[PDB]
Amino acid sequence: RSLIVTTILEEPYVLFKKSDKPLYGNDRFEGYCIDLLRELSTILGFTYEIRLVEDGKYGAQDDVNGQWNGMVRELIDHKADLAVAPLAITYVREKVIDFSKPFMTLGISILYRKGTPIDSADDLAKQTKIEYGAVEDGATMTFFKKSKISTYDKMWAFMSSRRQSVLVKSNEEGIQRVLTSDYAFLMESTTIEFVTQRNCNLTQIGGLIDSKGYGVGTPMGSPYRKKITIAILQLQEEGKLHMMKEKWWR
Amino acid sequence: NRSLIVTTILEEPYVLFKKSDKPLYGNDRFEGYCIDLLRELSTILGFTYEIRLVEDGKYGAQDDVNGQWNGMVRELIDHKADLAVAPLAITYVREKVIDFSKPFMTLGISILYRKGTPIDSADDLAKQTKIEYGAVEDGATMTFFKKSKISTYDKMWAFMSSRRQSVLVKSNEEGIQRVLTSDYAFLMESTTIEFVTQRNCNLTQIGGLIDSKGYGVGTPMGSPYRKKITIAILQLQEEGKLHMMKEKWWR
Ligand SMILES: N[C@@H](CCC(=O)O)C(=O)O
Ligand SMILES: N[C@@H](CCC(=O)O)C(=O)O
Ligand SMILES: [Cl-]
């Protein structure tokens, strides 16, 4: 049977391929992650059907009901077999689902404009004229919400007392807020790298706040975890992953 | 509750003999980044352990003819150790015989060589033969070149393979020495080069990273510790401890 693969829209990992003619099925999709899934499928010999995550979320745990959502939720309830997307490997997520070894490594950092006085996270945390935030219900938000490091603690208190204002639905939404207002955006460095190759106005600020990877997500105990790990290491070793990265970051 | 058996290998600054005027015994003989990591893990997961240096002094590679493994990987396969806590690279071939925790450090193959030369990549090395070059025998680095379809890298393996017993060394320590005393460039892992170049201001990493990979804790395939150690490592990383460990030992 075909594998149900849940994913999410996120340039340049996953996007609607553009064409003069209507497109159908998996062929509607292109991107780094789309190329990766193809590769994985030819090495492992499986067929698959790509489905965008219904609630359009990556996956976080609700404070009250303690229930999950997004792509994470869909693996837990076995609605999908694989989650192929820029899905960050995190502590809280490993406790409910499995991940393959990372196909890409990265970290949280700051998207802002060039030539400003702001040069680190600490600079953002010690002022308030410059508003800042991040994708809601994402690994980045969760990092701050759970952090016990002073600066990040403070930054979360600020973001938390302004959920409606500074938190955004999507990366795209955040990027636009940076481009159109006086706003700094806490986001993942690989995605930042794509934004700055195309927005000469913008730049990463400071270094990486943490380190993490994107892995293929599976329901806990799935046979495909180990298998996809092996396929990913092959692709990496033979230089294909680096070629894919180059292709989609230009 | 039986302690775990932890296989490891000597490699600065991941693992080393603690310097002492008085003879040390058992676990007390060892210190380093990996030793620290091992202490963190044992507190989080609540286990005790016995440290054992892999007897053959090898990381682990498979023989072409017989299909048999050596080193720390052999120790895990044979179930002679419960964990491998070392700068052990997560690779395709190893992953088929053992399990790995999610990585505690990511890095890549690059080049260790002297300053003040016009050579800026592996392609520079690959086309000449005056400047000799090699890597650690039966390690993930030698294996990378041995298996690569990339023209430049295939060429470099032809060179290394033909000069096996004079350009391949038993350890990073050996390689570091050859670079320092001869016209020799050493293919090694970037994390280790970073340690070397800080200690030795006349050396430098030539070019960027030739590939990407991570170190992970090794377990026998199917071990229940794989998942738990993955979670512990992700904990240590997220709370900032792994970064502190790196600065502590890379000063
Ligand atoms: N890729 C992230 C979402 C983006 C972010 O949180 O910055 C995740 O897995 O949740
Ligand atoms: N750390 C390497 C050995 C050193 C090298 O090959 O450069 C390994 O896991 O095999
Ligand atoms: Cl794992």
Sheet containing B203-206: give its strands across: B132-134, B184-189, B109-114, B203-206
Whole-angstrom distance, CA of residue B63 vs CA of residue A226: 24
Q: Do A107-211 and A1-106+212-250 fall under one CATH topology?
A: yes
Query: Could you tell me the two tokens for B10?
Result: 């000597």
> CATH classification of A107-211, choosing from 3.40.50.300, 3.40.50.720, 3.40.190.290, 3.40.190.10?
3.40.190.10
A59 touches A70 (CB < 8 A): yes
Whole-angstrom distance, CA of residue A153 vs CA of residue A21: 50
B23 marked among binding-site residues: no
* Helix axes of A32-44 and A240-248: crossing angle, nearest 10 degrees: 150
B214 touches B105 (CB < 8 A): yes
> CATH classification of B1-107+213-251, choosing from 3.40.50.1820, 3.40.190.10, 2.60.40.1180, 2.60.34.10?
3.40.190.10
For A201, phi then psi, to 5°, come to -75, -20
B206 touches B111 (CB < 8 A): yes
Nearest in space to A96 (alpha carbons), one of A113, A109, A82, A77:
A77
A210 touching chain B per CB within 8 A:
yes
Dihedral sign for Cα atoms in the order B137, B141, B147, B153:
negative
B87 marked among binding-site residues: yes
Give B229's Cβ-side CA count (13 Å radius): 24
B234 touching chain A per CB within 8 A:
yes
Nearest in space to B54 (alpha carbons), one of B102, B18, B24, B86:
B86
Per-domain boundaries in chain A: 1-106+212-250, 107-211
* Helix axes of B33-45 and B225-238: crossing angle, nearest 10 degrees: 110
B160 touches B134 (CB < 8 A): yes
Give Cβ neighbours of residue A9 (< 8 Å, ≥ 6 apart).
Answer: A15, A16, A52, A56
B73 touches B83 (CB < 8 A): no
One-letter amino acid at A5 equals V
Question: Following DSSP, what letter does each residue of B88-106 receive, concatenated?
Answer: -B--HHHHTTEEEPSPSEE
One-letter amino acid at A104 equals M
Q: Where are the beta strands (DSSP E) in chain B?
A: 4-8, 16-17, 30-31, 49-53, 83-84, 98-100, 105-107, 109-114, 132-134, 184-189, 203-206, 213-215, 218-220
Find the closest chain A residue to B140 by CA distance.
Answer: A237
Cβ-nearest to A95 among B92, B213, B231: B231
Give A29's strand partners: A16
Residue pairs spanning A and B at CB distance below 8 A: 71
B7 touches B75 (CB < 8 A): yes
DSSP-derived secondary structure letter, B18: P
Q: How far is CA A124 from the centre of its chain?
A: 23
A90 touches B234 (CB < 8 A): yes
Whole-angstrom distance, CA of residue A94 vs CA of residue B227: 8
Residues of B79-106 as b/e, b for ≥16 C-beta within 10 angstroms?
eebbbbbbbbbbbbbbbeebbbbbbbbb
A130 touches A118 (CB < 8 A): yes
| Dihedral, CA of residue B191, residue B229, residue A190 and residue B142, to nearest 10 | 40
Nearest in space to A208 (alpha carbons), one of A191, A220, A223, A224:
A191
One-letter amino acid at B25 equals Y
Whole-angstrom distance, CA of residue B122 vs CA of residue B154: 11
| Dihedral, CA of residue B117, residue B121, residue B126 and residue B130, to nearest 10 | 10
B125 touches A215 (CB < 8 A): no
B111 touches B227 (CB < 8 A): no
Q: Which CATH architecture has domain B108-212?
A: 3-Layer(aba) Sandwich (3.40)
Give B107's strand partners: B213
Q: How far is the CA of B229 from the centre of ligand 3 (A)?
A: 8
CATH superfamily assigned to domain A1-106+212-250: Periplasmic binding protein-like II (3.40.190.10)
Question: What's the resolution in A?
Answer: 2.3
Q: Do A237 and B91 count as a contact with CB atoms less than 8 A apart?
A: yes
Cβ-nearest to B235 among A91, A211, A229: A91
Nearest in space to A136 (alpha carbons), one of A167, A164, A159, A99:
A167
Breaks in chain B (C to N > 2.5 A) come right after: none
Instruction: State the structure-solving technique.
Output: X-ray
Whole-angstrom distance, CA of residue A19 vs CA of residue B200: 56
For A78, phi then psi, to 5°, come to 55, 35
A212 touching chain B per CB within 8 A:
yes
Q: What angle do CA A94, A100, A103 make, to 5 degrees?
A: 120
Q: What share of chain A is helix, strand, coil (3-state, %, to 5)?
A: 40, 20, 40
